[PDB]
Amino acid sequence: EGRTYFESLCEEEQSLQESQTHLLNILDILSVLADPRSSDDLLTESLKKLPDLHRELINSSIRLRYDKYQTREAQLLEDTKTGRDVAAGVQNPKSISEYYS
């Protein structure tokens, strides 16, 4: 269906926030792998959470790219409409054709 540039751009920011949360959840697991005074049990528990987040990050970075393409085709679709098509909505031709005359 036909989407607008404004609606397709605001939907990109929704899919951007989902990619941020999985990114921050992975990055703290790499931090607790790098603690100097780290404990024996936290380095076993954190690694079990790792493959479930990894294939979830790819499914969010793919939908981010897919909505970068759908806004690009909606951007160019609105530029070809500009010009004499926007002013084909007035219903007072006799008032302007005597004002310019």
């Binding site: 540039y5 751009l9 990619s19 792998l33 790098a34 493959p51 790819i58 970075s61």
Partner: protein, 98 residues
């Protein structure tokens, strides 16, 4: 060395859909840098090689955490900037038509 009619309209289209976008292409550098990093730790390779981003740090991995949060705000502010610039052009197009 001739060309075709199909071969001309295939380069007439690649130019028309070519964008350079510095805030967006810098964010995907961070998303790409972690998937290749958590790819190798699943397999088991972790060595003192400089082909990847880094091996194991407290400061420099948190420097990647800062880079993941800085470029997110640069991308978020740029989408907001394209939002308000599209709203303003629609208003002046309507008040001129008024």
């Amino acid at each position: 060395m001739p060309l075709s009619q199909k071969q001309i309209d295939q380069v007439r289209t690649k130019v028309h859909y070519s964008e350079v976008d510095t805030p967006f292409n810098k964010y995907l550098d961070i998303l790409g840098k972690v998937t290749k990093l958590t790819g190798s730790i699943i397999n088991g390779t972790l060595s003192n090689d400089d082909s990847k981003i880094e091996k194991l740090t407290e400061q420099n991995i948190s420097q990647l955490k800062e880079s993941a949060h800085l470029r997110f705000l640069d991308l978020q502010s740029s989408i907001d900037t394209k939002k308000v610039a599209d709203e303003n052009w629609e208003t002046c197009q309507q008040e001129t038509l008024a």
